[PDB]
């Protein structure tokens, strides 16, 4: 249904990415605040195509783990 | 791959649920801190069966939106 991405790693690195993501605001629907399992950021998209546009446009550090999934 | 659940609603209600979830600690793998789109809590499970055990055991208020999905 609705594609999502999880970016896991250092909170400072994630804060910098979120900053840089603002430059490509049309490539994602929403971005979450930084959370953790009681650092991770969650992003949603309108389609798989938009998700891929996003991943093809933003350079994500090798130290950040990227996971994909879908919300029903 | 790995099933997840999103519980969306009032942060206070979510805090109470997290409290009550501790009583069924074997019904989920992890529970997140409360986040928002820059209130929501995320839960992961080891299988769909565990997820369903969880949903069949915990009473979730009608005012809380429950969404399911999977992380690859």
GROMACS .gro file of C-alpha atoms in nm:
model
  144
    1UNK     CA    1   0.000   0.000   0.000
    2UNK     CA    2   0.211   0.291   0.129
    3UNK     CA    3   0.593   0.254   0.102
    4UNK     CA    4   0.814   0.356   0.395
    5UNK     CA    5   1.184   0.373   0.470
    6UNK     CA    6   1.375   0.344   0.794
    7UNK     CA    7   1.711   0.516   0.829
    8UNK     CA    8   1.905   0.383   1.127
    9UNK     CA    9   2.224   0.516   1.281
   10UNK     CA   10   2.382   0.813   1.458
   11UNK     CA   11   2.131   1.080   1.566
   12UNK     CA   12   2.363   1.363   1.454
   13UNK     CA   13   2.407   1.207   1.110
   14UNK     CA   14   2.029   1.163   1.090
   15UNK     CA   15   1.976   1.528   1.186
   16UNK     CA   16   2.210   1.635   0.905
   17UNK     CA   17   2.026   1.412   0.655
   18UNK     CA   18   1.688   1.552   0.757
   19UNK     CA   19   1.837   1.896   0.698
   20UNK     CA   20   1.954   1.796   0.350
   21UNK     CA   21   1.623   1.619   0.275
   22UNK     CA   22   1.446   1.955   0.292
   23UNK     CA   23   1.615   2.034  -0.041
   24UNK     CA   24   1.422   1.746  -0.198
   25UNK     CA   25   1.088   1.803  -0.024
   26UNK     CA   26   0.894   1.672  -0.324
   27UNK     CA   27   1.064   1.332  -0.308
   28UNK     CA   28   0.885   1.214   0.009
   29UNK     CA   29   0.546   1.257   0.176
   30UNK     CA   30   0.654   1.284   0.540
   31UNK     CA   31   0.957   1.243   0.765
   32UNK     CA   32   0.943   1.155   1.134
   33UNK     CA   33   1.119   1.294   1.437
   34UNK     CA   34   1.410   1.083   1.562
   35UNK     CA   35   1.301   0.787   1.771
   36UNK     CA   36   1.453   0.475   1.925
   37UNK     CA   37   1.366   0.134   2.064
   38UNK     CA   38   1.246   0.180   2.422
   39UNK     CA   39   1.839   0.633   1.647
   40UNK     CA   40   1.586   0.593   1.369
   41UNK     CA   41   1.394   0.814   1.127
   42UNK     CA   42   1.089   0.701   0.926
   43UNK     CA   43   0.980   0.829   0.584
   44UNK     CA   44   0.665   0.763   0.381
   45UNK     CA   45   0.609   0.809   0.008
   46UNK     CA   46   0.316   0.821  -0.234
   47UNK     CA   47   0.458   0.535  -0.441
   48UNK     CA   48   0.752   0.304  -0.504
   49UNK     CA   49   0.852   0.534  -0.787
   50UNK     CA   50   0.875   0.835  -0.555
   51UNK     CA   51   1.070   0.626  -0.304
   52UNK     CA   52   1.319   0.529  -0.573
   53UNK     CA   53   1.345   0.888  -0.699
   54UNK     CA   54   1.434   0.981  -0.341
   55UNK     CA   55   1.696   0.707  -0.304
   56UNK     CA   56   1.847   0.790  -0.642
   57UNK     CA   57   1.870   1.162  -0.556
   58UNK     CA   58   1.997   1.168  -0.198
   59UNK     CA   59   2.342   1.042  -0.102
   60UNK     CA   60   2.314   0.837   0.216
   61UNK     CA   61   2.631   0.763   0.418
   62UNK     CA   62   2.750   0.402   0.422
   63UNK     CA   63   2.732   0.419   0.802
   64UNK     CA   64   2.355   0.459   0.787
   65UNK     CA   65   2.141   0.146   0.753
   66UNK     CA   66   1.853   0.179   0.506
   67UNK     CA   67   1.548  -0.045   0.531
   68UNK     CA   68   1.236  -0.055   0.316
   69UNK     CA   69   0.886  -0.177   0.387
   70UNK     CA   70   0.518  -0.108   0.335
   71UNK     CA   71   0.232  -0.001   0.560
   72UNK     CA   72  -0.110  -0.152   0.492
   73UNK     CA   73   0.980  -1.032   0.642
   74UNK     CA   74   0.941  -0.867   0.983
   75UNK     CA   75   0.586  -0.758   1.085
   76UNK     CA   76   0.532  -0.417   1.248
   77UNK     CA   77   0.242  -0.222   1.391
   78UNK     CA   78   0.180   0.149   1.420
   79UNK     CA   79  -0.041   0.280   1.698
   80UNK     CA   80  -0.151   0.638   1.632
   81UNK     CA   81  -0.329   0.878   1.864
   82UNK     CA   82  -0.303   1.070   2.190
   83UNK     CA   83   0.045   1.060   2.348
   84UNK     CA   84  -0.099   1.008   2.698
   85UNK     CA   85  -0.312   0.716   2.581
   86UNK     CA   86  -0.005   0.572   2.407
   87UNK     CA   87   0.200   0.610   2.726
   88UNK     CA   88  -0.067   0.417   2.918
   89UNK     CA   89  -0.071   0.141   2.654
   90UNK     CA   90   0.307   0.108   2.662
   91UNK     CA   91   0.275   0.071   3.038
   92UNK     CA   92   0.016  -0.204   2.998
   93UNK     CA   93   0.217  -0.372   2.718
   94UNK     CA   94   0.492  -0.447   2.970
   95UNK     CA   95   0.255  -0.708   3.115
   96UNK     CA   96   0.269  -0.894   2.782
   97UNK     CA   97   0.640  -0.851   2.712
   98UNK     CA   98   0.659  -1.186   2.532
   99UNK     CA   99   0.400  -1.081   2.273
  100UNK     CA  100   0.627  -0.835   2.088
  101UNK     CA  101   0.996  -0.798   2.003
  102UNK     CA  102   1.039  -0.424   2.054
  103UNK     CA  103   0.841  -0.106   2.114
  104UNK     CA  104   0.954   0.242   2.015
  105UNK     CA  105   0.954   0.573   2.196
  106UNK     CA  106   0.674   0.809   2.097
  107UNK     CA  107   0.740   0.995   1.774
  108UNK     CA  108   0.556   1.220   1.530
  109UNK     CA  109   0.565   1.353   1.176
  110UNK     CA  110   0.810   1.642   1.164
  111UNK     CA  111   0.176   1.078   1.824
  112UNK     CA  112   0.285   0.735   1.707
  113UNK     CA  113   0.442   0.423   1.855
  114UNK     CA  114   0.598   0.141   1.649
  115UNK     CA  115   0.616  -0.229   1.742
  116UNK     CA  116   0.796  -0.520   1.576
  117UNK     CA  117   0.729  -0.892   1.613
  118UNK     CA  118   0.903  -1.220   1.530
  119UNK     CA  119   0.608  -1.338   1.318
  120UNK     CA  120   0.252  -1.274   1.209
  121UNK     CA  121   0.143  -1.526   1.469
  122UNK     CA  122   0.308  -1.330   1.751
  123UNK     CA  123   0.155  -1.009   1.615
  124UNK     CA  124  -0.191  -1.166   1.621
  125UNK     CA  125  -0.135  -1.308   1.971
  126UNK     CA  126  -0.054  -0.952   2.076
  127UNK     CA  127  -0.363  -0.802   1.911
  128UNK     CA  128  -0.585  -1.075   2.055
  129UNK     CA  129  -0.447  -1.021   2.407
  130UNK     CA  130  -0.430  -0.643   2.445
  131UNK     CA  131  -0.739  -0.424   2.446
  132UNK     CA  132  -0.673  -0.117   2.233
  133UNK     CA  133  -0.903   0.187   2.269
  134UNK     CA  134  -1.129   0.265   1.973
  135UNK     CA  135  -0.973   0.613   1.969
  136UNK     CA  136  -0.637   0.466   1.874
  137UNK     CA  137  -0.570   0.391   1.507
  138UNK     CA  138  -0.394   0.059   1.445
  139UNK     CA  139  -0.196  -0.002   1.126
  140UNK     CA  140  -0.004  -0.308   1.015
  141UNK     CA  141   0.284  -0.351   0.775
  142UNK     CA  142   0.611  -0.531   0.712
  143UNK     CA  143   0.975  -0.428   0.702
  144UNK     CA  144   1.198  -0.595   0.444
   0.00000   0.00000   0.00000
